[PDB]
Design a protein around this ligand. Structure first.
Ligand SMILES: O=P(O)(O)O[C@@H]1[C@H](O)[C@H](O)[C@@H](OP(=O)(O)O)[C@H](OP(=O)(O)O)[C@H]1O
Length: 1721
């Protein structure tokens, strides 16, 4: 019949004197029970997921119960023991898998696993039970033990031992050794109707109720009870059920992350109800229970909308799935209602909301697919184990709140309070802890499952282990977790009082201090004072006092501090002596120098207390430098001495990072520095890991080659250094080097810092470097060893910091001017005009940096407004001291009550290097989003909204990459949501008003049109509108309101934009723009008419932005018939210089009326209206309303037939399109343009384009100057000459391995060779920094020179050697980064990789070989490159193809005036292009094997984009090619041919599906391909000579590759493209006659054969088409026969053509028949 098996999943129903299913009290409490009234057989229980067990085989518990005697002092023997405990724990797994399915026999020895708990049921032999006294305690242990073994032996003798166990059977589970058999009790429990199961001989029998067979393949199958989220495929939004308005509602949630599948919220899951008959285990339906609350899903009252239902039994809650597999992405439908869910966009009371509202729909959409994402059971158990907590505190906090709690409770809750600290740290902290590292997912759970709510709700009203036992948990939960932190500082109005309650509560604050910061200080104020008065009174050793001290950090701290000094000067007494003054202290230090106790013990307290707080003073002195007098440091001890000279330096010269000079100068030298820069750089900058840096050291060891009164302290210094050296003769830096290093540490910063504040411009502070070289070098130079390395580690930042500093900018200043020796003219050894007087004025500016506001005497008067010199030389080439200008800058961030700000400040506004400076400007960026948040809280003392603005624009007029850098997820939606939060209500009347500019400088999306403002939907998604109807509103901000709208929602790419240019204002808008806005503007400014005509432009412009996007799936049909009729109304205006930017914007708005309108017209007179308008114009030169009015006459003259429907006649429109086109020299004699060839030209190929349409109709300055020149001549000469030598040395590295072999001859087996591949693994790790910069780029250089060894001087074993030694796999893993970084080098980056690989495809394969392996890790990254062309593609074609298509001069030939400087611009344009191109070349040079070409089962792998892209420049070119200029344009040709060879290496495999898919997916590209060659070049010349040899050698090879096969389908699509027989025979008689008739070509040209191995490739292609068909027999007759002289020069082919195929044994598995091989003498 039907048995049980290992891996079946069932439930047990007791039937002794008590009946029931066994079950747990949760994941907190580990007790077993049977709640008898919860459920019987007929009426299954409610929460039956807690009464399922899996039959597990018998577990091996030998070496784990031995490792369970952690009696052992040895470490290596506990490691053996546990290793065993582990290996057994597993060997268990393995065997038990094997025992899966196996029929249990009675008296087999089976354990019974608790699923929801996952714990094993266990008898604990050696105990009493809790509720029954004699019975052994039965509990749920996680891992199991021998007392988890239970003979499944029979109860009633209906079956016996041996017999297989049937489903249902009643048995005695009898512990194997743990004694008495299982027995469900008769005693209920204290807190719950539930009985405690215990091990006692009793007459209890167990009914074996099977749940889910062992046939539960998972994770493989969604089977009932699985837990999954239901992602939205389109809305990239999980499905989520919460309360809004105390009301349970379901919703997709909007996430602010940058990865929609990480916005995981416990509130976002669902449990699967594969409906059955009996409650038991792809075609039936399924029900969904909201995991969190317990309710089920249903769509009730679009006909239906998903929302929550409280019991899962009614038939609404019943759904079905549509394409069962895990992680399936299904389309579901509602059963009781037959509707296919469907998402809306309507959300409520909030500002920028998230809970999106969901219905269903009788119509099967396609995009509405849900990913059946499966969730971690462990995750699962997390939520469970947390709920548990929530309720435990639910009872206890509800039970110690209105009274007392028992002693049993405390014991458990504290326990808990323990267990938590345990979970939330991912199992690290606990107690004598060791580490404490937080866990993000579980913290989050704390918040969203209202654990937190409970705790607080628990404290509220002995505590020694509650709070700040609690406050330790919290100290935890907030850690590093910003989101949570914004709680632990505020949480906290308590936790300061509670921060008193615990000597254990200081920790709270301190964690704070470190991570937490800014908001703490606030609530304390002088509260602190009580605590420190208190603490200084109560913390004697002041330890708590002290941790209060090291709590000091950040600038804002110093104040309360000093006041304390006051009370602390109050506190000064100490009853003890610290004295001598030289004498008795040096004694107290000998006395402490004895290791003594008591006395010598106590001492330490003070020292500590001092060093920390003292340093607590930052760059704060005076009151510290006052506080710091005698600068004594003989017994310097631990940097006391040091921190003291440190404050004593805060008292003298703030080193302002001089950096005096500028100009091309700098760069040359950096080159000189060479790699070491790098070396040092990477070591410190990177080699966070000591090693790497260590290396750059190997680099070093190789290298080898109040000024006075401060000095004094110094001398003391250079000694302690030299000292720190001989100690460096001390190699062992063991432990000593805590001390000594520590000491050194401050020192060095210091000393570093030292050199810095006291360097001087002569050989000397320099020679002090020499002794440094010795220092650095003499500076020599796992498990516990990491903690320790810490030191050597800081020992780096500085050693390099140090090393760097000097090394860096210090290194090399003199050489600069020193070579002052003279040039051309007459000797002059150093033996922007007066740059010294605006940098000595600018020193008056450093000087300026110094000051403060209390010097009432010097503050306003003397300094005054230097800005003028600034304003005067804003125009002048930035000086080097502009960062130092910025110095001046930084300060002002403090405030601005005074008004004088603006003046000096505006000098800063005065600048002429926005791009370069602005990138620097972002620095405030956070500070700034303040200044626009503050500057915006008082705008729509004045200089922070205006200077916050000027900042805005100088950025806003900046690089696309600039536009990109706004990245205002942190925080646009808040400079908008907040900037609006006050600026929407607030609008300024004309003419001064400012909300439209700081908002407006932002949307410069390439200065029009509607592209690159994707960010706008969400930010603009989430807002409060502007005003309407009765009444009126405030000027400026409205106008502002309309256009900005356009800019947010003008994306031509998303259908929102129609509903957008419609949502809110819509068609209705038109009406209110008939009257009453003049009234508002009248009232609105003295120049009211200015506000009312800007309203006319706004009201005219709804076409313009994303106008392609406005129309769309259905925009125009809605406004069909109303809006044009409505438009005549505003047909008349005047005085419009402004309003004629509203007739040029009412000539681009008026341009947006009739383009996309093919079939919605039934109205009149529009034409006459426009025409009269263009005639009635006055004012500015026509050129613009003749390009707005000429642009009109073309857009109107093309359509031909639709406009003639539009009116009786357009006869005034060709004497106006022929007066607008005939014209004069401006229209009289302005004489202002000099690219005529380009004008008349783009005009005449635009007039050739127009022709086509019609048929488809329906003393000192000399110093500055001679300097500039010798700089140019020198620069050219020099710069040009040296870099090659530097590239050769850069090549020196490439030796690489052998290099480590020579000199570093590395004995006892050291690792000289193979220095590349690890430096490698290294740098790959290195890009984790957002900025890789020239470091990266310089690498790039050294690789293409790795190509240099074989060229720049075996290569493929170097290509294949890196290959070998960490090769290919890395770089690949890498290039992905080139999105953000490398963007401007990733191009460079690409070229370099490709060279060293190519021609050595073998090593490459090794590459791939490796690569595929990451099948998943591999397949996603795919879609990329694709969209980088693709992306590069559609648009890229557009940009320069069409302006180029109007080509030059399209006016006949026998002041060439060919537009000047064309080549530089196309290079620029073809920058991003060029990226894409070099791409092509690489793509070609790796191809080889088929699976390679096969584009492994990637995520988005459609070669299609290439065709599109190819197709893209092709785009419009069905006939003999008329892009011409674009076709006759150069950069195009290289890009292509490479595409033809890469593409050519793809269909070269001749994949039947390859050749078949292409043309299809391009469904055009192909055809074009065909069309060019039968009009192969009209423009002859060098330019045309290359258009032929490409046009036919690439076409030849490519054509060939696509067609080297047999089917029938893949031939037709290309043929129909050509009048092929005639296009190919008169192109083979016009290329073979054009190419044949000359015969002066170069001979034996390995190189080119063009019109004949081509024209012959014609004859070859034709030859290859004759396999089947009848049409091809047709075009086939002519070579096939003929005496004709053209069929006899064609005969001159067929015989002088090979015209014969080569024999094929067949490659791969005996398959394809044949293909020709040239041999046509
Ligand atoms: O940038 P940070 O400081 O890492 O902070 C995260 C950022 O705000 C994410 O947008 C947010 O996800 P959502 O937008 O989906 O909330 C995430 O929340 P989470 O931690 O709750 O996922 C934050 O932790």
């Amino acid at each position: 019949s039907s048995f049980l098996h290992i891996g079946d999943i069932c439930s047990l129903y007791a039937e002794g004197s008590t009946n029931g299913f066994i079950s747990t009290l949760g994941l907190v409490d580990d007790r077993c029970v049977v709640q008898p009234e919860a459920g019987d057989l007929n009426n299954p229980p409610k929460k039956f997921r807690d009464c399922l067990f899996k039959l597990c085989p018998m577990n091996r518990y030998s070496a784990q119960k031995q490792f369970w005697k952690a009696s052992t002092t040895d470490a290596v023997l506990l490691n053996k023991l546990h290793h065993a405990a582990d290996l057994e724990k597993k060997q268990n797994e393995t065997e038990n898998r094997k025992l899966l399915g196996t029929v249990i026999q009675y008296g087999n020895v089976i354990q019974l696993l608790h699923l929801k708990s996952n714990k094993y049921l266990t008898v604990n032999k050696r105990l009493p039970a809790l509720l029954e006294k004699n019975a052994m305690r039965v509990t749920l242990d996680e891992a199991g033990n021998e007392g988890s073994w239970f003979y499944i032996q029979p109860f009633y003798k209906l079956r016996s031992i041996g017999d297989s166990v049937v489903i249902g059977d009643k048995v005695v589970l009898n512990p194997v050794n743990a004694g008495q058999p299982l027995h469900a009790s008769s005693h209920q429990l204290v807190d719950n109707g539930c009985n405690e199961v215990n091990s006692v001989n009793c007459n209890t029998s167990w009914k074996i109720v099977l749940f889910m067979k062992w046939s539960d393949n998972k994770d493989d199958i969604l089977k009932g009870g699985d837990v999954v989220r239901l992602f939205h495929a389109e809305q990239e939004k999980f499905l989520t059920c919460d309360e809004h308005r105390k009301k349970q509602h379901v919703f997709l949630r909007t996430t602010g992350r940058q990865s929609a599948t990480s916005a995981t919220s416990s509130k976002a899951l669902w449990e699967v109800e594969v409906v059955q008959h009996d409650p038991c285990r792809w075609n039936s339906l399924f029900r969904f229970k909201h995991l969190a609350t317990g309710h089920y899903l249903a769509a009730e009252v679009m006909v239906y909308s998903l929302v929550s239902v409280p019991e899962g039994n009614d038939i609404s809650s019943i759904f079905e799935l549509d394409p069962v597999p895990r992680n399936s992405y299904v389309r579901l439908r509602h059963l009781c209602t037959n509707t296919w869910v469907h998402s809306t966009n309507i959300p409520k009371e909030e500002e920028k909301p998230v809970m999106l509202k969901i219905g269903t729909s009788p119509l099967k959409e396609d995009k509405e697919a849900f990913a059946i994402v499966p969730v971690s059971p462990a995750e699962v158990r997390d939520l469970d184990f947390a709920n548990d907590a929530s309720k435990v505190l639910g009872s206890i906090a509800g039970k110690l709140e209105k009274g007392t709690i028992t002693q049993n409770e405390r014991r458990s809750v504290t326990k808990l309070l323990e267990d938590l600290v345990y979970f939330v740290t991912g199992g690290t902290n606990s107690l004598e802890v060791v580490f404490s590292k937080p866990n993000r997912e579980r913290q989050k759970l704390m918040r969203e499952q209202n654990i937190l709510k409970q705790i607080f709700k628990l404290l509220q009203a002995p505590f020694r282990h509650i709070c700040r036992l609690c406050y330790r948990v919290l100290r935890h939960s907030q850690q590093d977790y910003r989101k949570n932190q914004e709680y632990i500082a505020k949480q906290f109005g308590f936790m300061q009082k509670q921060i008193g309650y615990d000597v254990l509560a200081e920790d709270t604050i301190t964690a704070l201090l470190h991570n937490n910061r800014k908001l703490l200080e606030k609530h304390i104020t002088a509260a602190e004072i009580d605590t420190f008065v208190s603490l200084v009174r109560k913390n004697r050793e002041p330890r708590f006092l002290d941790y209060l001290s090291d709590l000091c950090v950040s600038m804002n701290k110093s104040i309360p501090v000093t006041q304390e000094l006051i009370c602390k000067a109050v506190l000064n007494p100490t009853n003890a002596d610290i004295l001598i003054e030289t004498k008795l202290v040096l004694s107290r230090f000998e006395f402490e120098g004895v290791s003594t106790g008591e006395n010598a013990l106590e001492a330490g307290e003070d020292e500590e207390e001092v060093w920390l707080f003292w340093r607590d003073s930052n760059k704060e002195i005076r009151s510290k430098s006052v506080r710091e007098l005698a600068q004594d440091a003989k017994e310097g001890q631990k940097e006391d001495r040091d921190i003291l000279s440190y404050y004593r330096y805060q008292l003298n010269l703030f080193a302002r990072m001089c950096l005096d000079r500028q100009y091309l100068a700098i760069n040359e030298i950096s080159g000189q520095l060479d790699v070491d820069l790098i070396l040092r750089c990477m070591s410190d900058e990177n080699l966070p890991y000591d090693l790497r840096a260590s290396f750059c050291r190997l680099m070093l060891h190789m290298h080898v080659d109040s000024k006075d009164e401060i000095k004094e302290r110094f001398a003391q210094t250079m000694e302690f250094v030299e000292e720190y050296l001989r100690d460096v003769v001390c190699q062992r830096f063991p432990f000593s080097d805590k001390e000594k290093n520590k000491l050194t540490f401050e020192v060095v910063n210091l000393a570093r810092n030292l050199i810095y504040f006291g360097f001087y411009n002569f050989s000397d502070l320099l020679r002090l470097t020499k002794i440094l070289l010795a220092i650095l070098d003499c500076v020599h130079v796992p498990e516990k060893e990491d903690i320790m390395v810490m030191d050597t580690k800081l020992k780096i930042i500085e050693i390099l910091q140090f090393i760097l500093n000097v090394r860096l900018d210090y290194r090399i200043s003199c050489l600069l001017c020193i070579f002052k020796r003279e040039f051309d003219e007459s000797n002059s050894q150093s033996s922007g005009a007066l740059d010294f007087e605006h940098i000595e004025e600018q020193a008056e500016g450093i000087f300026g940096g110094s000051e403060e506001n209390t010097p009432l005497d010097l503050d306003d008067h003397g300094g005054r407004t230097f800005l003028r010199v600034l304003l005067h030389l804003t125009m002048h080439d930035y000086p080097p001291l502009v960062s130092g200008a910025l110095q001046l800058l930084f300060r002002h961030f403090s405030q601005r009550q005074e008004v004088l700000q603006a003046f000096k400040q505006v000098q800063l506004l005065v600048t002429s290097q926005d791009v370069d400076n602005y990138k620097q400007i972002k620095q405030d960026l956070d500070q700034l989003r303040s200044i626009v948040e503050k500057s915006e809280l008082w705008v729509y003392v004045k200089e922070i909204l205006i200077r916050l603005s000027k900042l805005c624009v100088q950025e806003s007029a900046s690089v696309r990459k600039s536009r990109k850098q706004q990245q205002r997820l942190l925080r646009n939606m808040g400079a908008h949501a907040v900037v609006l939060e006050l600026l929407q209500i607030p609008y300024e009347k004309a003419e001064d008003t400012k909300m439209q500019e700081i908002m407006r400088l932002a949307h410069e999306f390439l200065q029009n049109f509607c592209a690159g403002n994707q960010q706008n939907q969400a930010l603009l998604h989430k807002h409060i509108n502007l005003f309407l109807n009765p009444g009126i509103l405030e000027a400026v901000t409205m106008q502002h309101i309309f256009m900005n709208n356009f800019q947010l929602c003008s994306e031509i790419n998303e259908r929102v934009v129609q509903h957008f240019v419609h949502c809110i204002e819509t068609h209705g808008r038109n009406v209110q723009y008939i009257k009453f806005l003049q009234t508002i503007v009248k009232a609105e400014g003295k120049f009211i008419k200015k506000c009312q005509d800007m309203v006319m432009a706004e009201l005219v412009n709804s076409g313009e932005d994303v106008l392609v996007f406005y129309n769309d799936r259905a925009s125009f049909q809605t406004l069909i018939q109303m809006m044009r009729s409505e438009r005549d109304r505003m047909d008349e205006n005047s005085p419009l210089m402004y309003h004629i930017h509203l007739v040029e914007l009412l000539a681009v708005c008026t341009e947006g009326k009739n383009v996309y309108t093919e079939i919605k017209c039934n109205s009149l007179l529009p034409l006459d209206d426009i025409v009269r308008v263009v005639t009635h114009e006055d004012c500015i030169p026509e050129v613009k309303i003749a390009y707005i009015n000429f642009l009109n006459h073309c857009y109107v003259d093309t359509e031909v037939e639709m406009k003639e429907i539009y009116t009786s006649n357009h006869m005034w429109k060709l004497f106006e399109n022929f007066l607008v086109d005939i014209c004069r020299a401006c229209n009289n004699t302005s004489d202002r343009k000099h690219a005529d060839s380009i004008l008349e030209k783009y005009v005449t190929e635009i007039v050739m384009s127009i022709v086509t349409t019609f048929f488809s109709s329906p003393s000192r300055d000399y110093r500055n100057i001679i300097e500039r020149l010798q700089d140019i001549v020198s620069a050219l000469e020099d710069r040009l000459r040296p870099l090659v030598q530097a590239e050769l040395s850069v090549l020196v590295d490439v030796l690489h391995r052998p290099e480590l072999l020579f000199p570093e001859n590395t004995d006892a087996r050291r690792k000289c060779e193979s220095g590349g591949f690890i430096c490698k693994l290294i740098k790959h790790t290195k890009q984790l920094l957002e900025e890789n910069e020239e470091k990266l780029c310089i690498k790039v250089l050294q690789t293409l020179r790795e190509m240099m060894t074989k060229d720049r001087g075996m290569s493929l074993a170097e290509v294949q050697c890196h290959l070998d030694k960490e090769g290919a796999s890395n770089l690949v893993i890498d290039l992905i980064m080139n999105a953000s970084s490398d963007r401007v080098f990733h191009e460079s980056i690409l070229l370099a990789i490709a060279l060293l690989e190519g021609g050595n495809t073998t090593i490459q394969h090794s590459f791939f070989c490796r690569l595929t392996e990451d099948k998943k890790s591999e397949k996603f990254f795919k879609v990329f490159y694709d969209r980088m062309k693709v992306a590069q593609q559609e648009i890229k074609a557009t940009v320069t193809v069409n302006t180029s298509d109007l080509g030059n001069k399209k006016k006949d030939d026998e002041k060439a005036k060919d537009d000047l400087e064309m080549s530089a611009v196309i290079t620029i344009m073809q920058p991003i292009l060029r990226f894409l191109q070099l791409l092509c070349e690489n793509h070609n040079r790796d191809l080889q094997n088929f699976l390679r070409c096969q584009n492994n089962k990637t995520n988005y792998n459609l070669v299609c984009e290439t065709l599109q892209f190819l197709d893209c420049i092709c785009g419009s070119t069905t006939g003999g090619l008329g892009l011409l200029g674009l076709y006759i344009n150069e950069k195009n040709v290289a890009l292509i041919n490479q595409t033809l060879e890469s593409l050519t290496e793809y269909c070269q495999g001749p994949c039947h599906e390859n050749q078949n898919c292409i043309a299809t997916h391009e469904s055009n590209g192909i055809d074009i391909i065909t069309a060019l060659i039968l009009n192969d070049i009209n423009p002859l010349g060098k330019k045309r000579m290359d258009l032929v040899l490409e046009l036919k050698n690439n076409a030849s090879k490519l054509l060939l590759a696509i067609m080297e096969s047999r089917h029938d389908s893949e031939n037709a699509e290309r043929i129909l493209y050509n009048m092929r027989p005639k296009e190919l025979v008169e192109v083979i008689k016009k290329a073979y006659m054009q190419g044949e008739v000359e015969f002066e070509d170069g001979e034996n040209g390995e190189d080119g054969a063009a019109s004949p191995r081509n024209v012959g490739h014609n004859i070859y292609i034709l030859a290859h088409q004759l396999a089947r068909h009848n049409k091809e027999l047709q075009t086939m007759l002519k070579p096939g026969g003929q005496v004709d002289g053209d069929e006899a020069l064609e005969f001159y082919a067929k015989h002088t053509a090979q015209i014969e195929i080569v024999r094929l044994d067949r490659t791969m598995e005996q398959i394809v028949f044949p293909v020709p091989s040239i041999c046509e003498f």
